Amino acid sequence: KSEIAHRFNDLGEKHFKGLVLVAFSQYLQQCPFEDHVKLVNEVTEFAKKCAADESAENCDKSLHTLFGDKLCTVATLRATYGELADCCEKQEPERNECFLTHKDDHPNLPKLKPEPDAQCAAFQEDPDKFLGKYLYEVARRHPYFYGPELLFHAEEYKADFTECCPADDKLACLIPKLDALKERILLSSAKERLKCSSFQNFGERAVKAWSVARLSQKFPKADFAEVSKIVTDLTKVHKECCHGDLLECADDRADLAKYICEHQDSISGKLKACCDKPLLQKSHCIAEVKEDDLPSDLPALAADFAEDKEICKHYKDAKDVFLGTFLYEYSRRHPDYSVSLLLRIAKTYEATLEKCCAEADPPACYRTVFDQFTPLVEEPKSLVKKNCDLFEEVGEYDFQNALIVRYTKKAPQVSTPTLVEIGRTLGKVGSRCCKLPESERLPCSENHLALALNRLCVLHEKTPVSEKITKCCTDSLAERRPCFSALELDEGYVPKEFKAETFTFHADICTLPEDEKQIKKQSALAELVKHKPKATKEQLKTVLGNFSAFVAKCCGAEDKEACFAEEGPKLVASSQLALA
Ligand SMILES: O=C(O)COCCN1CCN([C@@H](c2ccccc2)c2ccc(Cl)cc2)CC1
Ligand SMILES: O=C(O)COCCN1CCN([C@H](c2ccccc2)c2ccc(Cl)cc2)CC1
Ligand SMILES: [Cl-]
Ligand SMILES: [Cl-]
Ligand SMILES: [Cl-]
Numbered sequence: 001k002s003e004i005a006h007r008f009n010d011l012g013e014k015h016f017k018g019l020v021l022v023a024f025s026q027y028l029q030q031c032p033f034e035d036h037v038k039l040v041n042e043v044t045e046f047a048k049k050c051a052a053d054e055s056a057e058n059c060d061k062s063l064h065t066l067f068g069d070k071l072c073t074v075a076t077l078r079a080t081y082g083e084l085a086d087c088c089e090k091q092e093p094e095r096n097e098c099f100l101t102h103k104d105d106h107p108n109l110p111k112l113k114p115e116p117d118a119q120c121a122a123f124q125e126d127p128d129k130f131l132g133k134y135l136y137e138v139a140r141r142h143p144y145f146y147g148p149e150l151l152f153h154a155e156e157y158k159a160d161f162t163e164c165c166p167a168d169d170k171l172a173c174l175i176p177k178l179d180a181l182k183e184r185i186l187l188s189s190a191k192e193r194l195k196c197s198s199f200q201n202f203g204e205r206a207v208k209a210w211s212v213a214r215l216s217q218k219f220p221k222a223d224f225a226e227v228s229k230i231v232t233d234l235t236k237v238h239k240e241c242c243h244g245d246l247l248e249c250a251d252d253r254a255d256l257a258k259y260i261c262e263h264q265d266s267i268s269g270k271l272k273a274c275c276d277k278p279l280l281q282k283s284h285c286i287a288e289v290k291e292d293d294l295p296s297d298l299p300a301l302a303a304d305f306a307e308d309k310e311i312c313k314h315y316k317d318a319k320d321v322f323l324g325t326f327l328y329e330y331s332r333r334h335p336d337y338s339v340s341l342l343l344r345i346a347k348t349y350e351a352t353l354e355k356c357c358a359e360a361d362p363p364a365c366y367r368t369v370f371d372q373f374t375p376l377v378e379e380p381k382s383l384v385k386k387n388c389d390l391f392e393e394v395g396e397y398d399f400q401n402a403l404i405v406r407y408t409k410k411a412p413q414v415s416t417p418t419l420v421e422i423g424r425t426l427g428k429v430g431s432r433c434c435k436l437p438e439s440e441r442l443p444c445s446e447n448h449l450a451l452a453l454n455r456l457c458v459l460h461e462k463t464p465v466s467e468k469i470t471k472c473c474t475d476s477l478a479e480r481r482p483c484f485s486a487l488e489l490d491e492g493y494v495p496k497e498f499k500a501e502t503f504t505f506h507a508d509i510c511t512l513p514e515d516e517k518q519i520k521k522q523s524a525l526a527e528l529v530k531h532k533p534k535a536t537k538e539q540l541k542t543v544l545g546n547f548s549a550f551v552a553k554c555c556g557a558e559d560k561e562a563c564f565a566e567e568g569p570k571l572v573a574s575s576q577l578a579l580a
């Protein structure tokens with residue numbers, strides 16, 4: 001009868017209110033926290049009224065009708081969100097579709113800076129307001145953040161403050177926990193954004209494929225029917241959360257967690273620990289669960305997929321099913337491959353069949369299909385071993401620098417902050433992945449690279465600057481990483497004309513945190529590449545070394561500014577000659 005009552009009843013007031021605040025914060029990213037609280041309280045009041053009597057007027061309205069109506073009441077909607085006011089002239093589902101089209105992925109809001117004393121003060125003063133504000137701040141900064149996961153992270157955030165405010169030293173307890181929390185927020189936001197991107201740009205089939213591969217790796221003991229069930233249910237969960245239907249997404253996600261845990265013996269031995277936890281914890285634990293051991297009875301795949309005489313008939317009859325089973329089977333056997341590698345392998349299997357089945361003697365043609373995968377496997381494996389070597393040789397900062405040079409050459413039209421961000425993000429991937437046991441390096445590296453490349457692609461939709469990026473971001477998802485890897489110096493670029501102030505430093509650099517100091521230097525690096533795009537990476541590193549020496553020296557000087565002013569122009573002029 002009443003959907004709003006149904007969800008209120010299923011989720012309870014706490015989670016209902018939390019998720020509604022998330023939904024609204026994500027749709028309306030600029031309003032103050034206090035204004036969103038009021039919309040949430042009103043919506044909740046109405047849900048309670050409807051729960052008491054579902055036949056009361058408007059109670060039987062859809063959630064989109066009710067929530068879209070609520071959003072469209074907000075003060076200063078024309079002035080703050082000119083685009084969203086336009087959406088408010090439409091009915092559902094056109095209105096919601098309009099709301100979705102107009103979410104902002106890079107709202108450029110100030111960085112969230114921990115103030116241990118004033119925050120612990122606010123936490124004690126009003127814990128509920130303090131935690132809601134956390135939901136709001138993160139939600140408006142990550143408009144596709146997986147709703148229920150944000151409630152999970154809010155409870156961690158709560159645990160951090162409960163542990164660390166009563167202690168003697170606040171900042172020493174807190175700042176490591178909050179820095180770790182922030183990193184987990186970023187990773188999580190990137191994973192989910194890839195999911196929503198994949199729905200948006202490649203459709204539901206791509207999400208399902210991705211998911212078949214990854215879930216088969218994690219749960220290799222499960223049969224194709226179980227994996228398919230879970231994939232079907234999890235795809236629906238992510239489709240709902242990506243479309244802003246957070247209440248339905250949360251309810252369906254809880255049902256999925258329940259199902260997995262009731263069938264854990266047939267799904268995976270690694271689920272036991274997850275399944276003895278509370279709800280949000282349980283879902284999160286399942287989501288991050290480690291891959292199960294390979295079962296000793298995994299089937300030989302040649303008979304069914306290369307040697308059977310009727311593969312063309314079975315392929316022709318039920319393409320999406322035959323290929324799905326292939327993907328399930330190959331993936332469960334290959335936790336050592338990345339998901340995109342498995343998707344490339346599946347596409348090569350398909351293409352081999354389309355070719356062989358239109359020739360005279362298909363069996364003799366498709367008998368070698370598995371051997372077609374060999375080159376697909378070896379390229380990424382070599383690329384990872386190669387980059388983990390550079391990483392172990394030079395350490396994180398220089399690895400970052402090398403990637404900055406590499407990506408700036410590929411796409412020098414991209415903004416310097418974005419180029420630095422991606423280079424820095426991919427350098428951190430080396431830190432994480434290269435330290436792992438070697439068989440895990442490939443999936444770790446390539447799965448994380450996908451997240452960073454997707455971030456680049458998302459930015460590029462909003463701020464297009466390069467046709468080569470556009471092609472890599474919009475041709476097949478499986479080929480995205482190879483496409484980016486195959487880009488070379490955009491020769492079409494006209495070297496950015498020299499501006500000396502771009503390479504001019506001052507003494508304020510000396511007061512910066514180390515990371516911020518590095519970002520300054522890395523920004524200069526990217527700018528050096530834009531002005532001298534044919535310079536070798538070794539020329540660029542030599543010049544960057546001189547910039548570092550100069551900053552370290554002038555920051556150690558008695559008269560820092562006099563140092564920077566006398567030495568800066570020399571360095572700048574010298575560096576042009578060094579980059580020829
Ligand atoms: O749709 C087209 O553009 C032309 O038709 C190609 C149809 N194939 C079907 C198989 N499909 C892959 C595929 C999709 C997305 C990324 C890689 C492979 C797939 C494998 C297993 C599963 Cl369960 C679902 C889909 C790729 C496209
Ligand atoms: O007043 C009482 O008797 C004690 O009840 C407090 C109930 N609160 C309501 C606000 N809830 C906030 C909240 C604050 C502001 C807006 C929406 C929800 C919330 C914070 C974190 C998560 Cl994970 C979920 C909910 C928490 C529970
Ligand atoms: Cl996001
Ligand atoms: Cl689709
Ligand atoms: Cl994972």
Ligand SMILES: [Cl-]
Nearest residue numbers: 397398545548
């Ligand atoms: Cl160095």
